[PDB]
Assembly symmetry: C2
Homo-oligomer: 123 residues x 2
């Protein structure tokens, strides 16, 4: 059972155990994957209200795995759920990149991962 | 330990156990919470290429809890991760409504839930 949750407001991780077996975390909100497996990356990025962003810079969020883009997301400054099921390997780094971090409202913005268990049953 | 994933191409649920204690799933892709707790609702909704769009409806995806919309998402027909962390109660029906079923590439489109453990360990 391995899961972590980073709240950007406080810059703290919350975790299943004191020293999780599956991941290491950093206080800038990056993770390193210690256990290869199927992971669910999740989170919600809250944009600053668009009336307050006075140029034409798009609201963009990317999740990286090492130096590869796992996904690129953009909407018109509306709340953005992120992530999905990804196959990760020991040693992989996961981190988010923002078009501009001034777009991001720290309060209630969060992200993390959960090591998924196998799902061998089907109906 | 309780997780389910619905694959829209096959209309099958993939599950941690033969009869998950935490949730009831049905073959229309809906589900019902059996165990009160913190849940991570997740998924990715993949739109077809814009050149196949027949109708004039915008790309909108909603998650309902019982009869009220819980989450409303929309973009310019791009990949759409859904969900986030929500407190749900025994009895809550969770399901998805799309603006137009034709908008969806069933192949890589999935959603489901995981009952979340507590994350008591901080920093």
């Amino acid at each position: 059972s391995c899961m972590v949750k980073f709240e950007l407001s406080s810059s703290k991780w919350h975790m299943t155990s004191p020293k999780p077996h599956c991941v290491n975390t950093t206080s800038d909100g990056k993770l390193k994957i210690l256990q290869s497996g199927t992971y669910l990356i999740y989170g919600q990025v809250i944009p600053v209200d668009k009336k307050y962003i006075k140029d034409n810079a798009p609201f963009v969020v990317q999740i990286y795995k090492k130096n590869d883009v796992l996904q690129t997301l953009m909407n018109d400054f509306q709340i953005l759920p992120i992530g999905g099921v990804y196959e990760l390997h020991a040693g992989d780094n996961i981190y988010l990149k923002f078009n501009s971090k001034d777009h991001i409202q720290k309060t209630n913005t969060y992200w993390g991962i959960i090591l998924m268990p196998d799902l061998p049953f089907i109906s």
